[PDB]
Ligand binder design. Structure first.
Ligand code: CA
Ligand code: CA
Ligand code: CA
Length: 338
């Protein structure tokens, strides 16, 4: 249009995920196009060519880590391009004046850190790709920061093609990271009204439940759920896991086939459990076969009740960790007294 660099975000499987929720620990497989086709067979002065050929990616450094060894420049046929290098700069102030002047002349402003891809030899780059109208594709994967997941928050990525010193902007690609915040309660039964005893008392030998509410995965998320587990390393000095637990959906779940599993539905059989009575730990994992059936357009959240017994006098704490695609999120810590 006619010189129209583009930027899209993709997941690992190559699905377009522009504007989608992206879980902490996920990778953004950004694809940048270097739009050269309109240049084919044109002639340009040596002087113009000497202004060089660059591609800037003003990536959101506060949120993402570049995965340097996944960054590739290819032509569209997939062939590796040599003669283009890339340099990350933590700021513009810290970049060569050559770079600062280049950007100023293209009227491009960047925020904090960015990447500059460079044609090492503008003459050979010209002859080989520009004159021949051979557009390129830059794969620039960048991974969400795990901590970001405690907070959530928007990030955006922006890019610029710079030919002959003229600058051309891609669209801005926006994503959001969900805040995942698991909760833990203490209850005597599964009744939905049952009293939270967090901060209260439990009798010796009383049977009770630790209720572990998982983090909420929002609709419109960017990739398959592979892992959603509840790991409860409880205090074996005061608590004994009786070997009974149940798992329930917390929301209506929409499957890929279009069916709906309603909120509160017993899904215990779509989970497995590891126990360890010695170190007092239990882990409940959804089966990956089940998780694979959830539509990317569905929210997801579950909760597990662990049947416990109080077996000593004293004050005992409990906290659980919800793992979501292998990132760990800790619940609040509950406390009861016997
Ligand atoms: Ca074009
Ligand atoms: Ca930046
Ligand atoms: Ca333990």
């Amino acid at each position: 249009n006619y010189i129209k660099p583009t930027k899209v975000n993709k997941n690992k499987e190559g699905l377009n995920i522009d504007g989608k929720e992206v879980l902490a620990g996920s990778t953004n497989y950004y694809e940048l196009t270097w739009d050269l086709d309109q240049y084919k067979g044109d002639k340009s002065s040596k002087e113009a060519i000497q202004n060089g050929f660059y591609y800037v990616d003003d990536y959101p450094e506060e949120a993402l880590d570049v995965r340097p060894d996944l960054v590739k420049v290819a032509d569209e046929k997939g062939n590796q391009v040599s003669g283009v290098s890339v340099q990350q700069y933590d700021s513009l102030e810290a970049a060569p004046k050559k770079v600062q002047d280049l950007l100023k002349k293209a009227n491009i402003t960047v925020k904090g850190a960015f990447q500059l891809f460079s044609a090492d030899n503008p003459e050979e780059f010209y002859k080989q790709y520009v004159a021949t109208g051979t557009s390129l594709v830059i794969t620039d994967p960048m991974t969400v920061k795990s901590e970001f997941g405690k907070t959530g928050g928007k990030y955006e990525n922006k890019a610029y093609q710079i030919d002959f010193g003229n600058g051309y902007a891609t669209e801005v690609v926006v994503n959001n990271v969900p805040k995942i915040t698991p909760k833990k309660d203490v209850t005597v039964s599964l009744d939905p009204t049952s009293e939270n005893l967090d901060g209260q008392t439990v009798q010796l030998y009383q049977t009770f439940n630790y209720r572990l509410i998982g983090g909420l995965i929002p609709q419109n998320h960017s990739e398959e759920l592979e892992d959603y587990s509840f790991v409860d390393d409880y205090d074996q000095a005061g608590d004994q896991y009786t070997g009974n637990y149940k798992t329930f959906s917390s929301l209506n779940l929409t499957m890929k086939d279009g069916s709906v599993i309603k909120a509160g539905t017993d899904l215990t059989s779509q989970t497995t459990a590891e126990t360890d009575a010695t170190n007092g730990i239990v882990t409940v994992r959804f089966k990956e076969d089940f998780l694979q059936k959830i539509s990317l357009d569905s929210p997801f959240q579950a909760e597990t009740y662990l049947q416990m017994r109080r077996i000593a006098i004293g004050t005992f704490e409990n906290t659980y960790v919800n793992t979501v695609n292998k990132v760990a999120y800790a619940s609040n810590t509950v406390r009861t007294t016997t």
